[PDB]
Amino acid sequence: SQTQGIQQLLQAEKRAAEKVADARKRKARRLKQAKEEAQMEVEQYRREREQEFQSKQ
Amino acid sequence: EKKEKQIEQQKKIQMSNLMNQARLKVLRARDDLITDLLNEAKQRLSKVVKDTTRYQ
Numbered sequence: 676s677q678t679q680g681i682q683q684l685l686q687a688e689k690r691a692a693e694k695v696a697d698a699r700k701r702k703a704r705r706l707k708q709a710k711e712e713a714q715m716e717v718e719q720y721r722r723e724r725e726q727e728f729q730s731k732q
Numbered sequence: 733e734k735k736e737k738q739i740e741q742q743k744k745i746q747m748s749n750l751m752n753q754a755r756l757k758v759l760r761a762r763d764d765l766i767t768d769l770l771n772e773a774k775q776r777l778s779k780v781v782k783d784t785t786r787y788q
Contacts, residue, residue: 728735728739731739
């Protein structure tokens, strides 16, 4: 009865912590994602700039 | 910026070099021509030596 309600208090706190953990995992995933788009764009800059260099040469 | 500046600088040095060797070629050609003239002159002198009277 009441102890079941207290179990529900604990479980609601648990799933709130699960939401927090999921949000933190989303943040880490987002930062890793940003890392590879950064890699892609810098690769693109290198390509544009080496085609410019061969053009100049 | 580093690589671009290096490349253009080397281009300038190469151009200045090429101009220099052009000038050097023309000048050495001048030298060769004048030395040829001198060689002809000494040959003429050798010819002049042959005649006995004016040589005396």
